[PDB]
Write a protein that binds this ligand. Structure first.
Ligand SMILES: *[C@@H]1O[C@H](CO)[C@@H](O)[C@H](O)[C@H]1NC(C)=O
Ligand SMILES: *[C@@H]1O[C@H](CO)[C@@H](O)[C@H](O)[C@H]1NC(C)=O
Ligand SMILES: *[C@@H]1O[C@H](CO)[C@@H](O)[C@H](O)[C@H]1NC(C)=O
Ligand SMILES: *[C@@H]1O[C@H](CO)[C@@H](O)[C@H](O)[C@H]1NC(C)=O
Ligand SMILES: *[C@@H]1O[C@H](CO)[C@@H](O)[C@H](O)[C@H]1NC(C)=O
Ligand SMILES: *[C@@H]1O[C@H](CO)[C@@H](O)[C@H](O)[C@H]1NC(C)=O
Ligand SMILES: *[C@@H]1O[C@H](CO)[C@@H](O)[C@H](O)[C@H]1NC(C)=O
Ligand SMILES: *[C@@H]1O[C@H](CO)[C@@H](O)[C@H](O)[C@H]1NC(C)=O
Ligand SMILES: *[C@@H]1O[C@H](CO)[C@@H](O)[C@H](O)[C@H]1NC(C)=O
Ligand SMILES: *[C@H]1O[C@H](CO)[C@@H](O)[C@H](O)[C@H]1NC(C)=O
Ligand SMILES: *[C@H]1O[C@H](CO)[C@@H](O)[C@H](O)[C@H]1NC(C)=O
Ligand SMILES: *[C@H]1O[C@H](CO)[C@@H](O)[C@H](O)[C@H]1NC(C)=O
Ligand SMILES: *[C@H]1O[C@H](CO)[C@@H](O)[C@H](O)[C@H]1NC(C)=O
Ligand SMILES: *[C@H]1O[C@H](CO)[C@@H](O)[C@H](O)[C@H]1NC(C)=O
Ligand SMILES: *[C@H]1O[C@H](CO)[C@@H](O)[C@H](O)[C@H]1NC(C)=O
Ligand SMILES: [Ca+2]
Ligand SMILES: [Ca+2]
Ligand SMILES: [Ca+2]
Ligand SMILES: [Ca+2]
Ligand SMILES: [Ca+2]
Ligand SMILES: [Ca+2]
Ligand SMILES: [Ca+2]
Ligand SMILES: [Ca+2]
Ligand SMILES: [Ca+2]
Ligand SMILES: [Ca+2]
Ligand SMILES: [Ca+2]
Ligand SMILES: [Ca+2]
Length: 540
């Protein structure tokens, strides 16, 4: 058909109501009276009564103002019946479009936006982002397009133009330079959005930016030069602690100190760090020792764990140390294999005039010499002059003496001012003299009767050679009660044989030898005889 165009109507209209929109006519009215009515939402349906028609003229009206924001369009159905009561025309659809008007102010997405950036970054860096909206049209008008802006950053210091915002997108960026967490950490700037691309109505928001941290700062010592005293030897011990103040953020690696000495003399120092006021705690690496050095001039520089965000001054601490003195024990010089001395020494004679030395050249402390180790008592010392003399009777020949030795240990004490011990061994070579003289091996026989065979006997000397070289056998009172002497060819033994057919048991034979001579006297080597033929038998 020839329909009927949609009807545009403005919003928030205002004048004298009613307002005729249009007029409709059924031509089938030649016959009876026609009754015009109309139906739909806004008509008889909810919102009832916005539009109504004059049953007799065919006029359509808007009865009151409208807000497209509420309902932006309506569709209606129109009718025409006869007085008799019958419909005449197939109904007719009707449309109305509600044209937008700038009745709406915009509104920010949130009531407050927050942001953060680091202090050392470069100009032209994107920080935050902000939103807002207008409910009016924005597809055929500007009643709903906004334009963003900024008008007041607080801390109007260092300067007041650190940022800008993209008018269309509302994004903010760092424009200037001079950000420092250490002086001004959080800005509060006021934003506004406007109707018709900055032309219409405006509103406010608030965005707040916190500033991350940077290693803008270096560490600073609170003393620059310290001093402490120290002892030579127990040690590995705490000398002095140090103080400092970095200014970036505390629990952070831009706040933790790292040290080191420049030069470690004997490399006898270690230094650690501590999460207190991360003071510098210095200590001794390997004890000290001395009388060698009293002075210690060393320097320690301090850094952070992480590198610096800028060239900065490295700052050292210069420190002086002094070693207190402890006084140590003295010592005999050697451990003496000294005196190759003979057995004939006169009880009270100079053996070893000895001396001991003591470390501490503070030496105005003497000591006393004491002896100590010990198989039995011979020797003697002058305690205030360390003089070892030889008292007593010695005898290389016999008991304690093991290999050609006699080892003895002695002491010495550090007095004068405190304490001390000195353990020193002393081996002294004893010597030989020909003391003893020759002696027979077996002392009792068992001779036989009829024809006894030679009674083997031998010789032994306690002395050391030559002193036991060859012999000379001799038979004293009974050199004839019949007894005849004899030597083995290979030196050592002697052959003892009677020369008479003598008696039934129990009787001695006086013996007498010599080796350089010395002559011993020996003696009786008794002789038990019991009935027989010729071989030395078990007796009775
Ligand atoms: C930003 O927020 C802080 C915290 O309240 C406030 O003290 C300051 O005045 C605001 N503006 C700037 C630029 O710091
Ligand atoms: C020396 O060391 C002591 C240790 O107690 C310290 O108090 C002092 O500051 C250091 N410097 C000087 C010059 O004494
Ligand atoms: C660190 O020590 C320096 C030296 O006096 C001082 O100026 C600074 O204020 C100290 N740091 C802090 C946080 O006080
Ligand atoms: C202190 O500094 C030294 C030197 O680098 C380091 O080895 C040590 O681990 C530090 N102490 C601590 C607790 O970090
Ligand atoms: C530390 O060493 C320096 C360098 O010679 C010296 O001036 C200072 O006296 C020493 N001790 C003290 C107490 O500073
Ligand atoms: C001699 O030194 C040795 C070796 O230590 C030791 O066993 C002995 O007791 C010391 N005295 C004598 C008399 O041998
Ligand atoms: C010296 O050392 C000895 C070790 O035999 C020890 O018994 C003594 O206590 C020490 N003397 C002193 C005066 O400290
Ligand atoms: C010295 O005397 C000390 C103190 O008893 C002792 O421990 C040490 O064994 C002794 N000997 C030596 C050779 O120092
Ligand atoms: C040997 O026997 C005699 C005879 O009785 C006795 O007098 C003597 O003591 C015994 N031994 C020695 C070594 O004299
Ligand atoms: C010093 O002492 C600390 C504590 O035991 C140890 O961990 C470190 O290895 C030593 N040496 C240094 C150079 O720090
Ligand atoms: C000083 O030395 C430290 C390393 O010990 C270094 O990191 C720092 O950059 C130096 N100072 C300067 C101005 O380069
Ligand atoms: C510490 O002080 C000494 C003496 O004044 C100096 O040699 C050293 O360089 C100083 N360290 C610093 C960082 O000034
Ligand atoms: C530490 O400071 C002293 C004096 O200020 C300086 O001479 C020295 O070069 C510094 N050490 C380091 C490693 O920077
Ligand atoms: C005494 O000192 C000597 C060093 O000549 C050593 O060989 C010996 O073990 C020491 N004896 C003791 C008990 O100290
Ligand atoms: C005696 O001398 C020998 C040879 O020098 C030596 O090796 C030994 O130790 C000493 N004493 C003993 C019991 O062997
Ligand atoms: Ca409206
Ligand atoms: Ca509107
Ligand atoms: Ca608007
Ligand atoms: Ca800074
Ligand atoms: Ca720092
Ligand atoms: Ca910082
Ligand atoms: Ca010493
Ligand atoms: Ca000392
Ligand atoms: Ca001493
Ligand atoms: Ca002897
Ligand atoms: Ca001897
Ligand atoms: Ca002999």
């Amino acid at each position: 058909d020839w329909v009927i165009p949609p009807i545009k109507v403005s919003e928030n209209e205002r004048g004298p109501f009613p307002k005729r929109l249009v007029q409709i006519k059924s031509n089938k009215d030649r016959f009876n009276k026609v009754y015009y009515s109309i139906t739909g939402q806004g008509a008889d349906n909810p919102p009832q009564g916005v539009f109504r028609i004059e049953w007799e003229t065919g006029w359509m009206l808007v009865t009151r103002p409208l807000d497209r924001e509420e309902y932006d369009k309506y569709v209606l159905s129109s009718h025409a019946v006869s007085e008799n009561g019958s419909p005449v025309e197939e109904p007719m659809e009707i449309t109305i479009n509600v044209i937008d008007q700038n009745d709406n102010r915009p509104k920010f997405t949130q009531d407050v936006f927050r942001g953060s950036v680091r202090e050392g970054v470069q100009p032209g860096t994107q920080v935050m982002a902000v939103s807002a909206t207008d409910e009016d049209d924005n597809i055929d008008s500007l009643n709903g397009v906004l334009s963003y802006s900024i008008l007041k950053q607080d801390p109007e210091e260092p300067i007041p133009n650190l940022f800008t915002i993209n008018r269309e997108t509302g994004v903010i960026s760092l424009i200037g330079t001079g950000l420092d967490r250490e002086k001004f950490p959080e800005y509060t700037l006021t934003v506004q959005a406007t109707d018709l691309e900055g032309a219409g109505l405006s509103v406010e928001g608030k965005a707040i930016i916190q500033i991350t941290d940077a290693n803008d700062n270096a560490p600073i010592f609170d003393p620059k030069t310290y001093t402490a005293l120290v002892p030579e030897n127990e040690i590995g011990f705490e000398v002095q602690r140090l103080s400092v103040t970095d200014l970036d953020m505390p629990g952070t690696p831009a706040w933790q100190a790292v040290y080191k000495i420049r030069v470690n003399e004997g490399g006898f120092f270690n230094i650690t760090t501590d999460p207190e006021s991360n003071q510098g705690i210095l200590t001794t690496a390997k004890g000290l020792d001395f009388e060698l050095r009293k002075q210690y001039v060393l320097q320690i520089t301090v850094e952070n764990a992480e590198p610096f965000s800028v060239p900065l001054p490295t700052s050292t601490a210069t420190v002086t140390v002094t070693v207190e003195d402890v006084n140590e024990a003295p010592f005999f010089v050697p451990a003496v294999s000294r005196v190759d001395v003979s057995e004939d020494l006169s009880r009270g004679e100079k053996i070893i005039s000895l001396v001991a030395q003591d470390p501490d050249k503070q030496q105005i402390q003497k000591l006393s010499y004491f002896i100590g180790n010990d198989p039995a008592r011979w020797l003697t010392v002058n305690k205030d002059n360390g003089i070892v003399t030889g008292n007593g009777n010695l005898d290389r020949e016999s008991e304690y003496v093991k290999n050609n030795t006699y080892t003895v240990i002695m002491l010495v004490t550090d007095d004068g001012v405190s304490v001390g011990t000195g353990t020193g061994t002393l081996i002294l070579h004893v010597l030989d003299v020909n003391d003893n003289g020759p002696v027979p091996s077996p002392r009792v026989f068992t001779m036989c009767d009829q024809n006894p065979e030679p009674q083997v006997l031998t010789i032994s000397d306690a002395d050391i050679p030559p002193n036991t070289y060859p012999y000379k056998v001799s038979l004293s009172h009974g050199s004839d009660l019949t007894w005849k002497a004899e030597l083995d060819s290979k030196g050592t033994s002697m052959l003892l044989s009677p020369t008479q057919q003598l008696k039934k048991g129990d009787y001695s034979i006086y013996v007498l030898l010599s080796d350089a001579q010395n002559n011993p006297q020996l003696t009786v080597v008794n002789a038990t005889v019991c009935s027989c033929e010729g071989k030395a038998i078990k007796c009775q």
